[PDB]
Structure 1
Amino acid sequence: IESDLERAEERAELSEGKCAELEEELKTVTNNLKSLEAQAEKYSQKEDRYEEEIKVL
């Protein structure tokens, strides 16, 4: 049972480290995603203004 406890402790430490790394990567990806969402919203605004001017002309 002591050997089993050692195995479990090592497995859990590995899993916790991996989870922390994945959380960091998720936060970075979320920042990138919101920046690109802002970019897309700007593009949509400009395209809408373009279409309005097109229909006016």
Structure 2
Amino acid sequence: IIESDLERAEERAELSEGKCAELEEELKTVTNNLKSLEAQAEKYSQKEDRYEEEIKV
């Protein structure tokens, strides 16, 4: 029973690890897309500041 539970526990370690890896890829995907959006926000903010500066000019 315990060995069956072990195979299942190992399977669950693998499924949860699997899901962690999936989340790591999804997380990196959104983190990297966030870096893109953050960078876009940054660029848009840099341009926004350039435009604010242009407004100031």
RMSD of Structure 2 on Structure 1 (CA): 1.8
**Closer/same/farther in 2, CA of residues 36 and 9 from structure 1, 3 Å limit:** same
In structure 2, runs of 5+ residues without a counterpart are: none
CA 1:29–1:3: 2 relative to 1, 3 Å: same
For residues 16 and 48 of structure 2, the distance between their equivalents in structure 1, rounded to whole angstroms, comes to 47
Q: Residues 1-57 of structure 1: CA distance to partner in whole angstroms, max 9, x if unpaired? A: 32322222222221121111111111111111111112112222222233333334x
For structure 1, the 5+ residue unaligned runs are: none
Counting aligned pairs with the same residue, the percent is 100
Q: Which runs of 4+ in 1 moved over 4 A?
A: none
Give the TM-score normalised by the residue count of structure 1. Answer: 0.68
CA distance 1:30–1:10, change in 2 (3 Å): same
Which entry has the higher C-alpha Rg, 1 or 2?
1
Structure 1 pair 53/4, CA: closer, same or farther in 2 (3 Å)?
closer
